[PDB]
Amino acid sequence: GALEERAIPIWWVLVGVLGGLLLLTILVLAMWKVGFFKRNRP
Amino acid sequence: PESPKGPDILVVLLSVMGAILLIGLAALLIWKLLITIHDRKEF
């Protein structure tokens, strides 16, 4: 009831979620650069 | 006491981070399966 106070994991959760999203992007980007997900089709 | 766990942020952040890693790994695995099926389906 004192607003400005304690820990609200909501910000940190978004930070973790945002960071986690970035992690996934790096793995996808790295594999794409290997052409592993890239194939020559007709 | 004031913090039985208190910074559940560590636990939650770890849990949040862990859950995402599992999702990231799982999605990657599915993509692999799709290529494997297409690569396997050659014949």
Inter-residue contact A28 to B23 (CB < 8 Å): no
Report chain A residues whose CB lies below 8 A from the CB of B16.
Answer: 13, 16-17, 20
Inter-residue contact B17 to A22 (CB < 8 Å): no
Provide the token pair at A9.
Answer: 């994991």
Closest CA to B24 of A34, A15, A21: A21
Q: What's the CATH number where B38 sits?
A: 1.20.5.100
| Experimental determination technique | NMR
| DSSP states of chain A | --SS-S--HHHHHHHHHHHHHHHHHHHHHHHHTTTSS-----
Measured in Å, how far apart are chain B's first and last C-alpha atoms? 65
Q: What's the CATH number where A33 sits?
A: 1.20.5.930
Q: Which residues contact A20 (CB under 8 A, 6 or more apart)?
A: B16, B17, B20, B21, B24
Chain A residues contacting B, CB < 8 Å? 7, 9, 12-13, 16-17, 19-21, 23-24, 27-28, 31, 37, 39
Report residue A8 CA to chain centroid gap.
Answer: 21
State the total domains in chain B. 1
Report chain B residues whose CB lies below 8 A from the CB of A24.
Answer: 20, 23-24, 27
The domain of B11 spans 1-43
State the total domains in chain A. 1
A19 and B17 within 8 Å at the Cβ level: the answer is yes
DSSP state, B35? H
Give residue A4's identity as a one-letter amino acid code: E
